[PDB]
């Protein structure tokens, strides 16, 4: 009965973790931020509309200069735009048109993309020949590649549908580290501001915090009733927010090791596709399947406002590094810049 | 007003726009088919007939019509995370082996392959992303099914079967049960064809069914339907 005794030991350890979490929960987040002023009403207008994609847009990512942004759509084209002038800087044809994620490097020299081909492609932007070339293809995942984020020009972290994350050295195309522990398909990841830790949300309704160097799972966070489609870190790095299919967003804290806040409304039954924070972290922006985006007071869980400008599902959204604008990309083949 | 480099950047952007519009038109003129079915149900034979890890993507051209066909059988991940990517396909080609009417699943004991293919067909046909999409159903291995139907009756799979062990009655029964798994009879049509060994009547059947689907789509666009 070696199998059963370890199951009882696992249940005992889960009981110990739950009791230790209940011990350190003297107050709630709502009880402390009950005295701060509400943010009012947030009315953001569509400043720019980026047109050109002919199919559903599945991902976008801002450059670190806050002016250039790559967008991935399933027409088989990565477009790199200039947000200020709505000019197309680059159009990159993809070998596989079934793309689900895109990333733009912090140096600005590379973009990445991947999807149902189980391959993360790294494209060089600053080439002597004047075009955009495939610099690297990273293969080794056995499921669809759902998210990718650059650490620097040589390292990238990918999440996949084979329930595993991976840290890759780009110049040798090898998986330096493999992160395992999730039992369902990992749908998103997010890097900390120091890029020492990253969080990942999977289809087992759980989020795992991972050390990048030592390759281990530090903490596991539960609470969601369905698949965690999106995840995003708090700007200090001590908290993250998850968007799931049970129509709720949740704010977890790494140091208290439990859920701090739930963002939900009875009007909203559709699942969340994307989450992000504002530069101060006061606003939490979430894209939904009801074709809209909601802006939540992240300290008070009130709906501060609505971004309503898309005719189909808001599939992706991002906030610039200076916090000047929010880009929303959607299944109706348009991106919109809001401020 | 713009500077010289701004004007040249706008001109580069408009050249990119024209290349995007041409590639979009060329993509629009092609036919996209999603290939589904149980493992070892004759999908590979279908791919070999049409041609003459990750997502396999097969191109062919028939009677000046281009076809992309997407095989997603190697995806072991959960289907509802990525099936919405195929929302705008022209048709779904679903392969069902008839000879599996008596073969138990090798992964799960005491579960039949034919019931598993009926459950997969019921999941796909009634999926919320494929309400209007039509299904071309291929019943493969009909000669092996005719060999098996003489010794092994259909009653071990369908106990409510009231017909005889002849080929045509049993094949019609399996076809009727697959077509009555269609809940949305009005919005979509199901086309059913039996396997042909080197006759090449399957590329022709796909061509005819896709032409019918394109005619119905044009009738819906023009407001007549």
């Amino acid at each position, epitope marked *: 009965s070696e199998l059963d005794q370890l199951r009882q030991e696992a249940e005992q350890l889960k009981n110990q973790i739950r009791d230790a979490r209940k011990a350190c929960a003297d107050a709630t987040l709502s009880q402390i931020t009950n005295n701060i002023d509400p943010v009012g009403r947030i009315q953001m207008r569509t400043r720019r509309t980026l047109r050109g994609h002919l199919a559903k847009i599945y991902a976008m990512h801002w450059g670190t200069d806050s*002016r*250039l942004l790559v967008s991935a759509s399933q027409d088989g084209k990565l477009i790199i735009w*200039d947000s200020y*002038t709505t*000019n197309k*800087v*680059h159009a990159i044809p993809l070998r596989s048109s079934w793309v689900m994620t895109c990333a733009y490097a912090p140096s600005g020299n590379y973009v990445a993309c991947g999807g149902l081909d189980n391959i993360c492609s790294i494209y060089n932007l*600053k080439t*002597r*020949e*004047g*075009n955009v070339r495939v610099s690297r293809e990273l293969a080794g995942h056995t499921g669809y590649l759902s998210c990718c984020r650059f650490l620097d020009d040589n390292q990238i972290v990918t999440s996949s549908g084979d329930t595993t994350c991976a840290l890759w050295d780009i110049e040798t195309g090898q998986q330096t580290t493999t992160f395992t522990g999730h039992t369902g398909d990992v749908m998103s990841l997010s890097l900390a501001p120091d890029t020492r830790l990253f969080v990942s949300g999977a289809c087992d309704a759980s989020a795992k915090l991972w050390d990048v160097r030592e390759g281990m799972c530090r903490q596991t966070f539960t609470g969601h009733e369905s698949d965690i489609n999106a995840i995003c870190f708090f700007p200090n790095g001590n908290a993250f927010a998850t968007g799931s299919d049970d129509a709720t967003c949740r704010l977890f804290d790494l140091r208290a090791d439990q859920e701090l806040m739930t963002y939900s409304h009875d009007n909203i039954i559709c699942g969340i596709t994307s989450v992000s924070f504002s530069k101060s972290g006061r606003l939490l922006l979430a894209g939904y399947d009801d074709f809209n985006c909601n802006v939540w007071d992240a300290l008070k869980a009130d709906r501060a406002g609505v971004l309503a400008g898309h005719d189909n599902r808001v599939s992706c959204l991002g906030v610039t590094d200076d916090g000047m604008a929010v880009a929303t990309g959607s299944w109706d083949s348009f991106l919109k810049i809001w401020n | 007003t713009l*500077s*010289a*480099e*701004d*004007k*040249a*950047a706008v*001109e*580069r952007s408009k*050249m990119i726009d024209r290349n995007l519009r041409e590639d979009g038109e060329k993509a629009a003129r092609e036919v996209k088919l999603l290939l589904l079915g149980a493992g070892e149900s004759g999908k590979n034979t279908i791919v070999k007939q049409m041609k003459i890890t990750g997502i396999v993507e097969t191109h062919f051209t028939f009677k000046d019509l281009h076809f992309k066909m997407f095989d997603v059988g190697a995806q072991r991940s959960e289907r509802k995370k990525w099936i919405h990517c195929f929302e705008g396909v022209t048709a779904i080609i679903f392969c069902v082996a008839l000879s599996d009417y008596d073969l138990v699943l090798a992964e799960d004991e005491e579960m039949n392959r034919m019931h598993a293919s009926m459950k997969l067909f019921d999941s796909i046909c009634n999926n919320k992303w494929f309400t209007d999409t039509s299904i071309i159903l291929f019943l493969n291995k009909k000669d092996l099914f005719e060999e098996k139907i003489k010794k092994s009756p259909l009653t071990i799979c369908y106990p409510e079967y009231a017909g005889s062990n002849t080929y045509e009655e049993a094949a019609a029964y399996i076809q009727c049960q697959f077509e009555d798994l269609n809940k949305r009879k009005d919005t979509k049509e199901i086309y059913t064809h039996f396997t042909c060994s080197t006759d090449t009547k399957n590329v022709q059947f796909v061509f005819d069914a896709v032409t019918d689907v394109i005619i119905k789509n044009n009738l819906k666009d023009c407001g007549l339907f």
Partner: single-chain antibody
Amino acid sequence: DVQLVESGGGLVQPGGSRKLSCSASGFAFSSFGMHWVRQAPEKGLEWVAYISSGSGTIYYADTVKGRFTISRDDPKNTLFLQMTSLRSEDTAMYYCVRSIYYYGSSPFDFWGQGTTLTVSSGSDIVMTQATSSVPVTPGESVSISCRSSKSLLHSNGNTYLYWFLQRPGQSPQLLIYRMSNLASGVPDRFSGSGSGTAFTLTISRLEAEDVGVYYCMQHLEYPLTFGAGTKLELK
């Protein structure tokens, strides 16, 4: 590697015609706009013509307007300058220069070797390089000054001033693009500081391969105009 090779020069009787060609290899030629820039032998660089990528925009200098015709053939990767009614002033060495234009790009980054053409016998921005020659020794910082008649700072925040170096016997090489940005392959000791109409190029810790003629060019408005050039020499 990137290569532009010019051909078609020689000796032409005045009033005649000639056709220069520039063959491109090693880069995506149809995505670059191309320029012809001449250099009369004693004098400095002078912009001649420009054809955009996709041939949608063509510009000429006023002293070659109506006589010269620039064209490109993109499947053969070739640039043509058909020159008629050749005068004595047309005698010069001609360079094809590639330049691509998007956000953050570096125009004028590669220059061809040039072909020699010998002919026997008002609102333009004026760039002024006041000092023609400067004597310098290695290891010493040096400043090169350029002055523009019009403010080169646009309303979008860009200042359109370019710095080129021509080593003796070689084609010009891009050093600084858009006043403060340094070019690919250029050492970090070069720096560019400008305030609207006055510009400075600083060379800290000068080496033996820094001698030659330094040109400032504006790219705010067509026609593109160069400075007269400031020469650095040893001792």
